[model samples]
Target: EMVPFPQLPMPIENNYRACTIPYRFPSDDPKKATPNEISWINVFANSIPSFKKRAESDITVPDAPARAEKFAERYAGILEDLKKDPESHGGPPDGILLCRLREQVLRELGFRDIFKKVKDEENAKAISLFPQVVSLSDAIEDDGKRLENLVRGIFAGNIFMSFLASCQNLVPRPWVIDDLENFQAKWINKSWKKAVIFVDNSGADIILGILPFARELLRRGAQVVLAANELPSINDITCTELTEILSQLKNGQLLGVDTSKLLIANSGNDLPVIDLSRVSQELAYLSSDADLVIVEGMGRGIETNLYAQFKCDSLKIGMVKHLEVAEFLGGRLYDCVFKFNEV
Candidate 1:
């Protein structure tokens, strides 16, 4: 029996507002948002550092400190816009608003890849830890458990999203991967010939988290397409940067990985959250033939597509770093969800 292709929602629409928990972050006290406008302002204020820190990194301006100061005030207007009449402008769906705010700040600062060095160092560090990861992976005698561990590692690596999503107090740490079953993935023993993986972050997220799993997909004779950002967005890997990361495994000290039909697709222009309905033309075409789609990260998978019905088998995995989001999902901060379904 064939599963009929699911009609996707309009990507530009703000479906996120319909949910009780708008995104991975927990809601502030509704008691506090009384009469309304102040709630939005307070929410927007929480993201100010997301801009200031970038300005500090991309200090190419005549008055970098002053420029950052002014930019914070200027950028707040977008939040105000969302608060006033969201869904009309490129606002609302909370996630989209966040994306626009980020884009605005990036443009204001004339930011280049502010996290280039950050990505470079993290990827190198992950490369150093590759042996340890493999040793642990190899220690698993059961293929199912090994595959499960790889998926868990990807969720563990997604802990990096915490820092991106306002968990600034967090430092990367060694954690254990518990047996995950809350969100069970079917087709555990099936072979999908092609996979379209939407990745997140660069350092350990990709190096340790993504590649090992991607390697397994490849080892099973599946063609791989890694969808990355067209422009730098929130420390996420860009297509060119992804090229650089792969080149390390290809030409340098990192070896023993495979990429037969490993291709890269640019998702589209710079925005922290992906609007899948507006994905690049090439991605749309390639995704048409895909057998698997893996949307990782809180921003892409949780914030946007918790309800997305797809044409193929899909895997959504991430750590709930936000206290409220974790609570909403009926889990804890480090609890990982592997929401998988085959159509």
Candidate 2:
């Protein structure tokens, strides 16, 4: 029995391609001084040289075990109390909240007293060197924005509105391969062999958007390879993490989308791991076998960067810009129109 195609709220009308700018890091060129350098200069002036220079005598060591024991006692007490009436003190404890609690406990346990004896007072001196900090912060912000712009430029015009148009329904649907299969079986009587999917890490809701596309690609006799980051802390789209989150969706008892078809690819755990320096060889290798490549999110500029480095002939599809459209369909469409440019 075949499920009838889900109806979409709005007709798919927009089919436009826009070019994105490239990413450039700080100090791309030598001899051109950036604000980061200027701030460092200021920080160096305010910073203390060494302990020997600042302190006339040696500092004594304190009893570490005793201090730790005291803190543990208080920490355990707080945890026990919080567990008894979790909602009494606001809501469930989060990472940031726990971090604040830990800091408070450490401060109350005289951690600052031990730090006071240290000759290097970086925190105290930071206020005096505020100008440098501000300059460095500004430089860092500029560098970040530049990198973001560069990434957005690379993925522009290639991804489609098909996925974005499906977000309105919230429930996952079969679109890509399923639609293509019916189209091919009825018309061409042929199906594609392989597809490479570049996934996004926009939490569980967004992952719901990628399922229909993956299903459609599979239905068309295409071997789908789902790529994501290796580590959970850096990129939230790791296969293990996604699987765990999907398993626990709508609470621990609820079931979500089936992700058995995805082929996991780790871009290492480092930030900006898809650059030309490290993953060029891997990108080139993957591009050889991939007939079609689907990238999700504006962050896909990294994939574009990899594409440029490897110069592979695979067709690239952008899913980020299409998210708004996918949302309009309640995320129900399978036959999404994606933008593709041939190398």
Candidate 3:
């Protein structure tokens, strides 16, 4: 049974408009899926094999391949139907709708997390590399350059497709919506007492990408809260998983920077996409005093909350991993989006 998502403490000006995508087309004259819908659906359809591969390897499930095959076929059929009749199966598909359907199918097939094994494995590897990553950041002399490196490291760390690479060979910048300099200026100029960061993915995405950035906030005397999903979605980290990782990283310091102010909260989001209006009550309480909010990942930052307005300063940072988003932004694949909106 699906439960309703709880509201978070943070307030936005227009909660209803959290997702920037158009829910429905203007007029259904064509009766066929629009380029927008087709593009997104194609992204979803292409992800089937990756999802299926993880589902089949779910050791806890019996006859995993049979169920995995069902998931692949069922989800593909839904997409095919959506392609033919855009109004079918909760027509007028949006990112949230598409992701929810995919997750629902996986859940029905008795697969809790198809990416669980990989998440653990990747987290282990990232944890091992955490010290070196932090020390490298420590070595940077210029404040602006260091902050830029940390932000770039975040883009590099969002490695759902690639692995084992660090900040040494990061994807060059000039992001599709590059706001690093602007954000960095704001970072150096202002003092945000509290920040609530909605994180994504496991492994380096969290350990390397987000942690160093969060550590910087802590060093600046800001309380940092890392909000993770309530449940597993794709390779995105869950609240429980994030808590475990933090515990492992604990010892009063995160690579010599004090971790006294770092925190983790459940975001009450089940899918990769998030509807910020409905987050966990605990997260709401924890972030009530937040003066800064950071939404990370393609699903939350780029795909969903790219245009979401917040009560205070907000930064939406993520790498565009989908062709549809790239096309929409007029940027190339793997292009980054660093959108900063100051209150």
Candidate 4:
């Protein structure tokens, strides 16, 4: 399913691919392996033990440990094949392909979502922190300062696997690619008629980070549409889960502001990485005429679609979690990328 909005340019367009770098070297080179390919494959390869552990312990699946062993064996074999042949398993390996293969392996082994347990647990913790988080933002008098705080909340929230949301203050400031000032300028100078935020994660990232930002947009009277995943992908919030969260957050106000303009749609994405050219028809329609687009999280905003262009203004915000990705950006692990492109 392609995005229906005619104004939004396809994610992959002439000379502007979403990924900023190639994972593999040119075909002319006899050696198929590049440092990028090896490192990326290793990144996925290293996760096998933890993923297998999660799969093995899943109460939802029957004979889960046995299936998890199969998952480990099969995915390891696939990664091994990719190591030998960069083009194997739909390679020249990219983030999208790697994530898809992992999910595919899990699904094939009868694991619906290995991370579902953690996601639910995180959501519960985040819900309890929502009011305090909002109050912190509400107490700020300056819009620029408040917006900056919210943006920082977004970066802190991206550390779902690395640290707790309560430790956001520990995420050192003066980010590697900080562009909050410019984004703040735009936020105050002009009002977008409609905004589409492609959200990530199941807990603080959604509840404490993106929701407040979306509420700010709603307070300013812009129609806000949140595009979430269609299915479970590494604890990413699904559209159904987001709808439920919204229903729970509703009490005629979002902490004090109206949420009447907020909407949710499935992005037709099954991986943490997204190809903007292919989103759900529902999302496309809901995001029609949207003047601003925000893609959040490491997988979608950093590992992929880091350079994705749109007809309107755009923002890509996330914290670099992978060593290869951090190296590619010439930044350290946990360094934030607040890339803002205004057209």
Candidate 5:
């Protein structure tokens, strides 16, 4: 019999405080936040217009003047509410959740998968690129070395993001951490029974980056659960979308993987940026068996769960798309953090 599936992440608590520019999510009082936190709050609030302009204008589906007008109106209402009564809207995760108003407006106009065209194009590109990537992994004689390169592949694949769309031509940088051997040594020898992949985005990010990495985990003898969004968000794949992608892959017999070792689970997240604190019941139960958790994307990995303490081993990977964040971390554009935890 084939292996079964699993679910989303647990609640996250801990690691959110910044007295710096553009990185702060106020706990309760923006007034009580660190001096730098105030700096961040001001800069972030003031920067909302450009962000709003970009967002409202970026709706691709049902492209029309009225749909764009609805987006602006809905977003403005959200912005007014957020500014008027900050306390009413939880923290940054909830605050960020408001961005879902976008998908809501787009969907209101009978549009789902606003970035579907881009997703289609990128998935094709990744499918074509998969052979070369697989050949490179096949070339590595040692399992550990192959696993290391697979990890590199995971991070390397992150460069193909819509958020980084302006620079899609740029290649991904090397892995973030130093001493690859020591890093690989820790998890490579350990026996992982089941791995839950908290995936992000569509196209190459999943096709070229995460699926290959997920296959490596399966080869290492772990049952793999692929978790994705419950609803579409800015090209981020829903579990349904992922299932469709997988179905297409299977029909085409692309990116050879053991189907029995894989299963799909919804993340119980309708928001672009998810809060680990509120996950689905299935995910919570399945996570009890979770020995290894892999979270991908800037929204979940960095924007929300970066400092979260987990009950099991965890790895977070995402390209630092923001100049502010990359600069703070002493990395460059297209730089990614390949953070692994053995908890």
Candidate 6:
């Protein structure tokens, strides 16, 4: 299992106010804007769109061994390049480098535009369309069926595919997709006594992706906790804050979903400073009356180090694959479902 690394909060002292621009809607007209409209915009800006494109373009359930071998050889070449120099030649590779490499490979394979051609405006438009789509769809009898249909509808579009393509740079490690799929398949069939969700960030689409899984876990009778960062900038989806938001939203009464059962962690301290030695003890005390646990987020930097202190049957899953799917589908299709397992 990979250990959590230290987390250093992004430097916000320089321009805390400027960051608010992204949060606000593009229009100032009160008549033109609605809460649902604003919520849709937020979804487009975040979530992993880039990675989604690569997955869609690359993933194949091949019928012939020759075709599978061809893909294998192509993948091997990319992996070799990645291993030789994890960082791109120009600079420290972020998410974009992976997209470029994938683009190069797909072009070589004769799928010229398979992973290119994403437009920001299109993404923004898709984001805006979500609320209306969901509302209209949910007018049908069964909400679950309506939601599943809605998601599938969005996924079948081209814009959602672009969003997934945008995520390649976010976490460019090898075998990311294979690992996530394995984790999902394993946990989906297993029974858990309790589950805790740690949110790394908040806003529109993040909540949308998370709530479905939370709803599923609740149906299975697992006690669920939604945590969040206590401070302003440090907020990454965590168990505590999610609970607060759900309560405020009245469990989809505001957004249009049924009620749910959720709990918030009482631990008031920032996760970064939490004593390492006591992590398991603290978690054990919190979950003593229950069984099974799930901790989310890539607690990067020092917080990653701190997470290593905890002793539990744990697994860390990344959102890259989900992001890839979302991008390929053109709108936010797959919710970012990164699950870590613990006994």
Best by TM-score: 4
RMSD of each: 6.6, 22.8, 2.9, 2.2, 5.8, 19.8
Ranking by TM-score: 4, 3, 1, 5, 6, 2
lDDT of 5 by residue, 1-343 (tens): 1122232223212333211224344354653334443343443445445534444455564454556566556655654555555443453323354455445655676655556667777777766666666766777898887876776666656665432232234434454433345558865675788888788878778877787777777766788888888877776878887887777667343355567878888878776566665667666666668887877877777666665556677777777776656666677766767777766
In model 6, what lDDT does residue 231 have?
Answer: 33
**Candidate 3: where are CA atoms >4 Å away?**
1-15, 160-168
Considering TM-score, which of the candidate structures 3 and 6 is the better prediction for this target?
A: 3
| Weakest ten-residue segment in model 1 by summed lDDT | 1-10
lDDT of 6: 0.37
Per-candidate clashes come to 0, 31, 1, 0, 2, 60
Off by over 4 Å in 4: 3-7, 10-13, 161-173
Question: Which residue pairs clash within candidate 5?
Answer: 11-277, 19-36
Q: Write the per-residue lDDT of candidate 3 for residues 217-317, one digit (tens) a residue.
A: 88878999999999899889999999899889875677677876888888789999888766777887887788888999888998887987666788999
How do the residues 28-145 of candidate 6 rate in per-residue lDDT, one tens digit apiece? 3433333432342223223224333333543342233343345445644554443344332332222333333433443344442222223223324444544554455446675354
Worst 10-residue lDDT window, candidate 4 = 161-170
Please list all clashing residue pairs in model 3, or write none if there are none.
9-284
Better of 5 and 6 by lDDT: 5
Window of ten residues with lowest summed lDDT in model 6: 1-10
Tell me the tens digit of each residue's lDDT in model 4 across 108-129: 8778988989998988888888
TM-score of each: 0.78, 0.37, 0.92, 0.94, 0.75, 0.39
- For candidate 6, give the lDDT of residue 2: 16
Deviation (Å) of 120 in candidate 4: 1.0
Using TM-score as the measure, name the better of candidate 2 and candidate 6.
6
